[model samples]
Target chain A: AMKIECRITGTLNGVEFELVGGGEGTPEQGRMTNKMKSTKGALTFSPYLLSHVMFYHFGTYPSGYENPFLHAINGYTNTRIEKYEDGGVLHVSFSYRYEAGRVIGDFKVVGTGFPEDSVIFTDKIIRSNATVEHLHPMGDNVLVGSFARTFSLRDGGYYSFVVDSHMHFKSAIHPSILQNGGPMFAFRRVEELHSNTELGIVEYQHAFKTPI
Target chain B: AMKIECRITGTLNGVEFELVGGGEGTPEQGRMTNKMKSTKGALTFSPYLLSHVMFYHFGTYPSGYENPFLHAINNGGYTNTRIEKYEDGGVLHVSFSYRYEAGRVIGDFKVVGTGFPEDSVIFTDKIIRSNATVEHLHPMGDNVLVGSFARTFSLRDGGYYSFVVDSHMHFKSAIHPSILGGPMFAFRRVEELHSNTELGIVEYQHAFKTP
Candidate 1:
């Protein structure tokens, strides 16, 4: 049982953000553990129709509705990925129990090697989940924190679990590539595409339910 | 090994048709034999713009460039189908050596049993090939066709093999529907939907390639 729904719209500073919800699960061992308070969240912040009840169920902007940039979430997303060989190790972890829209996100530099052959497993982040925090600056090299982040790609092949609710809006004095999650996002890239055993656990129960 | 490419545009009576080409083959015994002359022939029926000098580089028409259509030739379309089980007996044949794009369309209603049960071999097409005179009288006879016409659905327990290249236009007491010589007006539908497992061929070629 894997079900999901997603909707996304974004703009920052100029303001216009939207993220709809989705949830339902059951897939254990390559890991899928869901329960972030049975998700269903919506966040539409802008002048956004001055909140006439979330603009009467999604509409009322520049002439009552036209959201383009993405509204993906028509799902079966029933995914499956099983790879066992060459020392067998594929582990993912996430555990969040929330009450009322709470968003706290962080994870930095988690590495693994063996995609198209070699990055040599880069600086220790093998597997993490204890509410991570590993930082280093000016001194560089070690900076990793987490609600949870596990990334790995290696083993004979086949993988597909893609969730792109991506949005871009910036006109800053300076904000160049501040590494993975500085772009208003949910980033998980397990690169190497084949069927990858199965892969869509509703692309992250709507990749962090709401308000990004 | 299967690979195919397609392109289509339509109109008849008004005069202007196109049929592109596709290839890559392998299948035997039950039959899908290829080649009618190594397969590659183009013969543009002008007012069609000179082939534009026999249209070699693929363009040229009223400045707007026309690819009119392809014309694949080289002959050897030998096909065969012979089935006989439960009650036993179903046969079909095809031998298009010289080629007229030959026409011999036939139809009649007949069926047998044991295929996903009940619907009991519905129009029991035991085995067939086509070019259209396409017909079906359904109450639950589930008939389908495309291109000129091609229909397939075999289920007793499980089965999958479908190809549909559809095109429609029939105004022939005025007599049209000709191709390679002229009057095709447009025909194309190269269909292939899946499920005979390895999980519907990796969930339909990665559901349309990419991640």
Candidate 2:
């Protein structure tokens, strides 16, 4: 019915964290044929966590991105959450896997909110391999797009982030196709991290139009 | 004799420029033996253009950096400049080449300032060529070393900027090779460019710490 609020703060391993809410789901499954689309729904940030992400589809263009009239292609998606703080009691769930380029995907987190750090997060808990390099735009529909990746936290302790993601796109793509039809929407995604142990370089930004 | 003030604004192809001044130079070569090193000097931003760059160095902590108090090993370098414009009384000297990781290097530029629009001059021209790759570093103290690299920009009637230049290197290199004996020194380098045509992403900060 079109009703989803949004708010996303930064730093997770880096500390500072904040997430709002959103509803009225709409975004069926995934695609790659018609151009590339992956839509899923469900959102909430209450105390923190409550999602089942997937909305990947972006048209690269970030050499500072310039637009004379209309020639921009950008879309975004890929998330996973299942968190509750003290309001509903407490529960934890996270299944996030990402590979930016043709826009890779991943999601898993059966259960656990804080079971003493959730037994060290089993399964693909969090594994993201990267090799999506091309142009590396940084403006107009921006694209510093997820620079280096390799962060297997919890116990495996594998941190890697030289900071990159000035990726920007406000939705106006159609230098080719998938315009009024669908896909392409990203207000901003500023990624920064700080690590010493507390996990430096855990910055995040959200603004999916209003579905942050 | 060490004193080089710094100031850099943004936007060139997008318009809007500002560059301060800095004097006193010396940073000769480039190396990657003990870890990484590339040095060269000379700075001045009057009207815009008076830089001959090269100061790209990083400590990969091959065990040649040790800290017993204030022992830090982290360095920086790499620059290109040779500009002079006045019209009534000035010549043209453009030699721009840049490639940031997995993104080969190519530099070229003609004239852009004061009056603007000179029919597109040209330079040491190569402007940009892609297909670059380098093994940057990261692991704490050794810092989040160069994330990605490769930025090929062109504008000889054919505007191009495939892009690739994600670098990050903080500090800490003293694991072996003989700590505190030799190796380590990268003052500063902060590159920020915002574009909109007249060029708006010009926030260059350079300072190869000589303290």
Candidate 3:
């Protein structure tokens, strides 16, 4: 089985907390610390922290953290994209869904013709659940969001993902906080989990140790 | 005026090492740990360690660690770029020279328009000092290198830098090792140091305390 060991830094309720652990499925589990207290338990419930680690991938969370688009584009898996012309304007539609059928969403945008080099698009979340709205900017029940897939020359031209959602949260709460929510943004260098290789294993272990 | 504190992991001669420190300049200094020992020092000469923390920005190191292009681009200072049409082709030349003149280098490439969106270029190091050669792919006195500057949509459209150099080093030496040297590569999100602002201060402080 694969495992993750990393350090995470975030702020909750204006107080900064640091968590070091093996992530979701490891023997040591995880530990969290702040000026007020240190707690040990399953981190599956902390949306503030998981939003940084787990939410970007295609998977399920503990509860109340479910979103149809959570796993949309992790550089790999459960992502769908279509390109076509309508009314003489090129359009592209991106969609992702979890196997269990609960988490899913669609992001459609106008294409600018550079489909191979990069695809940058933005859309409005006309209908979103509490979890999606909480992490994004919601006005009149609409959320502003965007996604980009670009080729990175680093590590031999791998595809990278950039997820951005405009939000109505305070930036001072944490440097990398997404719980107070979007404008939530994240960058992933790899398209998919490299769990099968030795270097990939080390990289994942190192990722867990990285503090954003 | 500014401080950096963070956890750094590397390998020395095959032994894994993890260091936690405020980088080169800070009150708490830093510490290093391995399977057998943990020590404290200026951390200026440990290229294997500083390669991750300090080498990217333009600055001077404690002797034997100096490079002319050490601080080419930190996303902010000591960077220079020029774009012009040449011989029926678009060309862009990027240069960075540390004020002290000790760190400097030039990267010139053929451009294909889109200068503002991104500039990706590659060149061969015809003549490089030991430090630069050691950190790059040196074969018969030549090193292959490349640099990229791209606009990132995240954080409201900031420019990002990615430095990649094909090297002749062993990958298993360390997950993030540069001492065994280049093909060394790095990615930086911000251009320059954000030291004068309050949030920048918190970010830097948190950066130190992060690991």
Give the number of the best model, judged by TM-score. Answer: 2
Worst 10 residues of 2 chain A by lDDT: A29-38
| All candidates: TM-score | 0.17, 0.29, 0.27
Tell me model 2's lDDT, rounded to 2 decimals.
0.26
Off by over 4 Å in 3: A1-101, A104-110, A115-149, A152-212, B1-97, B101-211
Tell the DockQ for candidate 1. Answer: 0.01
Sorted on lDDT, best first, the list reads: 2, 3, 1
Model 1, which residues run further than 4 Å from truth? A1-85, A103-212, B1-190, B193-211
Off by over 4 Å in 2: A1-146, A150-152, A155-157, A161-212, B1-53, B56-146, B149-152, B163-203, B206-211
Clashes of each: 27, 73, 24
The 10-residue segment of model 2 chain B with minimum total lDDT is B30-39
The DockQ-derived docking category for candidate 1 is incorrect
iRMSD per prediction, in order: 27.4, 14.2, 14.8
Q: Provide per-model DockQ scores.
A: 0.01, 0.04, 0.03
Q: Could you list the CA RMSD of all candidates, in the order they appear? A: 24.6, 18.3, 20.5
| Model number with the top lDDT | 2
What value does the lDDT take at residue A201 in candidate 2?
15
Query: What value does DockQ give for candidate 2?
Result: 0.04
Clashes of 3: 24
The prediction achieving the highest DockQ against the true structure is 2
Candidate 1 yields a Cα-based lDDT of 0.19
